[PDB]
Write a protein that binds this DNA or RNA. Structure first.
Ligand SMILES: Nc1ccnc(=O)[nH]1
Length: 73
DNA sequence: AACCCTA
């Protein structure tokens, strides 16, 4: 199985997901095995597009890990 | 109050 899930995260919350030097998001990539793409900043947008791609288990785990981070902030 | 990776 290989599909993509799309979400949108406000600009002020994406730093918590990424972490300093991208350490947090890199960890989420490594643990989940999912391909994760956070869009470049868009000056006329309040949020960032995030795409999670991979197996059903990988996408689910990536989403779980993202929610853990969001639930702190 | 807001970490900037991968690609
Ligand atoms: N208020 C919100 C917090 C986290 N994620 C959202 O999409 N919205």
């Amino acid at each position: 199985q290989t599909t993509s899930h799309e979400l949108t995260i406000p600009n002020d919350l994406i730093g918590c997901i990424i972490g300093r030097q991208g350490a947090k998001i890199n960890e989420i990539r490594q643990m989940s095995g999912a391909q994760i793409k956070i869009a470049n900043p868009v000056e006329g947008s309040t949020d960032r597009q995030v795409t999670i791609t991979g197996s059903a288990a990988s996408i689910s785990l990536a989403q779980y890990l993202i929610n853990v981070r969001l639930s702190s902030e």
